[PDB]
Write a protein that binds this DNA or RNA. Structure first.
Ligand SMILES: Nc1nc2c(ncn2[C@H]2C[C@H](O)[C@@H](COP(=O)(O)OP(=O)(O)OP(=O)(O)O)O2)c(=O)[nH]1
Ligand SMILES: [Ca+2]
Ligand SMILES: [Ca+2]
Ligand SMILES: [Ca+2]
Length: 341
DNA sequence: GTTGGATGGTAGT
DNA sequence: TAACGCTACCATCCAACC
């Protein structure tokens, strides 16, 4: 089994540099302006020049501008980046039809039937990197290993503009030596719980009682880590099937007034239903981000598909329930559809 | 006993 | 000082169903 994982470098910012090459070589910050006041919002991503100074995905735009007042600030044009992404995913499908698109900028290819060893895989990785450069002028990072998890780890190690193979001997080394916090799916909360248990490396999961591990981090995470530690993780590459589709928007000002919130909620439903593209959902959830940035939701699953008209009717009832059951003001409001027929 | 929807936690991007 | 946006998968609680 040979898996090749590709992740596009500083993606949104890189696309903007392709579209305007005078930007290349200096700080570029792509921003999600929320409209609440001038420069309210968050950074979607920045190029590596901006990252040197701490400007990166998730920080407030006002904070970025405090640090780098003279950087180029651009509004997120997600439809444009999606056009580029879709073209690159099509390029990748020419190298293998067994492709799992995992995000707007990354995919796993099962290349087992396309190459015979890691030497051939590495050369295919370079061909892929060259193809994407020729066609789209986008640099990417490639990770290659025996499964999805280690191909991802390989790319994480090699970025930006990298290519890295983690062969069988290195997999066994990493099971002993890799900080378990750097394993995909282990965030800060799980990492701290593992630490308390004295689990610092994957190999350490083999000498703790499963019941103790399970009790602390849950059954699914425990089984996942053990499978990796035994070098028996074998999750197949599978075609991505979207399970939910939604939109959430930021309100100009916080509110508990139904008629004030409704316009935003309806905008979210319209954009959401458009996104559905022939999909027919049986479940709807109204999602509210409260004034203190907590996320609350109310939902309903129907025995049949939900028409746009039913989505309008039901969403108001769900927003009403949130208001009735939660005293706090609402800051962001939206909808998510799921359980597609 | 057992499912599985409602709601939220965790992760990552 | 400010905190967008989107999606996946898992856990818990509890009403409905064996
Ligand atoms: N709105 C928004 N978009 C994000 C956020 N994080 C990532 N994205 C978008 C913009 C990124 O360019 C794109 C791909 O995510 P990545 O995690 O792979 O980061 P990126 O490619 O920008 O940097 P890279 O060199 O991988 O580190 O997805 C975020 O917090 N908010
Ligand atoms: Ca990336
Ligand atoms: Ca990525
Ligand atoms: Ca981590």
């Amino acid at each position: 089994g040979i898996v090749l994982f590709v992740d596009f470098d500083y993606f949104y910012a890189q696309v903007e540099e392709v579209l305007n090459p005078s930007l290349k070589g200096k700080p570029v910050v792509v921003c999600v302006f929320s409209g609440r006041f001038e420069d309210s919002g968050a950074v979607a991503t920045a190029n590596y020049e901006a990252r040197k100074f701490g400007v990166k995905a998730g920080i407030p735009i006002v904070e970025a501008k405090k640090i780098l007042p003279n950087a180029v600030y651009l509004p997120m044009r997600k439809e444009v980046y999606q056009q580029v992404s879709s073209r690159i995913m099509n390029l990748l499908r020419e190298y293998s039809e067994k492709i799992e698109i995992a995000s707007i900028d990354e995919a796993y290819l099962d290349i087992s039937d396309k190459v015979r060893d890691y030497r051939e895989a590495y050369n295919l990785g370079l061909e892929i990197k060259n193809k994407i450069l020729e066609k789209e002028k986008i640099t990417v990072t490639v990770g290659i290993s025996k499964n999805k998890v280690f191909a991802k780890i390989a790319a994480d190690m090699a970025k930006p503009n990298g290519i890295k193979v983690i062969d069988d001997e290195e997999v066994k080394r990493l099971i002993r030596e890799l900080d378990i916090a750097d394993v995909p799916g282990i965030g800060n909360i799980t990492a701290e719980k593992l630490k308390k248990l004295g689990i610092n490396k994957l190999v350490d999961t083999l000498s703790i009682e499963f019941d103790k591990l399970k009790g602390m981090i849950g059954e699914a995470k425990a089984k996942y880590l053990i499978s990796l530690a035994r070098d028996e993780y074998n999750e197949p590459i599978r075609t991505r099937v979207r399970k939910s589709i939604g939109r959430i928007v930021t309100m100009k000002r916080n509110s508990r007034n139904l008629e004030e919130i409704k316009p935003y909620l309806f905008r979210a439903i319209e954009e959401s239903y458009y996104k559905l593209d022939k999909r027919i959902p049986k479940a709807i959830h109204v999602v509210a981000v409260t004034e203190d940035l907590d996320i609350v939701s109310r939902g309903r699953t129907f025995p049949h598909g939900i028409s746009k008209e039913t989505a309008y009717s039901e969403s108001v009832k769900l927003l009403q329930k949130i208001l009735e059951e939660d005293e706090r003001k609402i800051r962001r409001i939206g909808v998510r559809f799921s359980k597609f027929i």
